[PDB]
Amino acid sequence: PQITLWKRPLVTIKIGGQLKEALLDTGADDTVLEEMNLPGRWKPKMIGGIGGFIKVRQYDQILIEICGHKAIGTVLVGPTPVNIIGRNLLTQIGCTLNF
Amino acid sequence: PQITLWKRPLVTIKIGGQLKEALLDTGADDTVLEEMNLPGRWKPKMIGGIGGFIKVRQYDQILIEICGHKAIGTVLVGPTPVNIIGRNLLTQIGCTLNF
Numbered sequence: 791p792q793i794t795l796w797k798r799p800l801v802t803i804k805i806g807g808q809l810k811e812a813l814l815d816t817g818a819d820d821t822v823l824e825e826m827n828l829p830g831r832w833k834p835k836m837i838g839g840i841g842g843f844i845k846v847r848q849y850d851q852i853l854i855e856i857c858g859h860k861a862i863g864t865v866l867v868g869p870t871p872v873n874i875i876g877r878n879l880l881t882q883i884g885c886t887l888n889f
Numbered sequence: 890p891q892i893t894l895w896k897r898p899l900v901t902i903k904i905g906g907q908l909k910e911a912l913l914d915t916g917a918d919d920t921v922l923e924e925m926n927l928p929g930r931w932k933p934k935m936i937g938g939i940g941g942f943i944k945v946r947q948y949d950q951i952l953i954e955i956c957g958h959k960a961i962g963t964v965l966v967g968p969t970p971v972n973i974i975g976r977n978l979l980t981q982i983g984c985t986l987n988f
């Protein structure tokens with residue numbers, strides 16, 4: 791699909807058996823999801839943005855389906871106010887900026 | 890142009906007659922630039938990011954050229970970690986997401 795930016799680029803994703811709404815975010819290096827109880831091993835990490843840093847849990851090789859396009863990579867879980875699909879997964883679904 | 894996302898989508902902008910580097914950030918509602926001097930009036934504003942809220946100076950109707958594409962809109966100036974171009978200006982240059 792083609793997504794205009796009049797409104798936030800929110801799309802439905804599937805992760806860990808759950809459906810969620812997430813932002814297609816070209817400004818996010820990594821993918822950050824709202825707090826969720828994923829299984830498996832993880833590593834602590836801190837990511838910075840406007841307002842400072844938040845502490846997140848890094849899970850590796852996590853499958854996410856973004857509007858039917860499958861992807862697998864690193865997913866950070868923490869107290870983010872928004873589900874954020876970052877460039878690590880946007881590349882995998884063939885997403886591009888165009889103007 | 891068509892921009893892939895294997896690298897951070899950085900572009901050169903011209904604002905107030907000065908060239909700068911900025912990040913095309915579809916996850917940002919607004920455009921936020923690092924501390925700089927801008928001519929004209931400004932109002933104190935607050936914006937929230939992943940790490941909290943910050944104080945910014947809001948400049949309205951500012952000319953900004955992004956990759957030779959002209960835009961005129963609101964530009965916030967404050968302690969952002971990176972110069973980001975938000976949807977308020979991305980829409981003006983006809984920017985869309987495509988996958």
Ligand SMILES: CCC(CC)CN(C[C@@H](O)[C@H](Cc1ccccc1)NC(=O)O[C@H]1CO[C@H]2OCC[C@H]21)S(=O)(=O)c1ccc2ncsc2c1
Nearest residue numbers: 817818819820837838839840872916917918919938939971
């Ligand atoms: C460093 C570049 C920007 C921050 C400057 C990075 N952000 C992604 C943005 O898209 C962020 C994503 C975002 C969206 C909404 C709430 C919190 C974060 N949006 C944002 O902060 O926009 C602000 C300006 O306009 C306002 O509209 C949204 C908030 C305001 S982020 O959320 O902080 C982020 C995401 C993954 C990541 N991986 C390593 S660092 C890192 C930082």
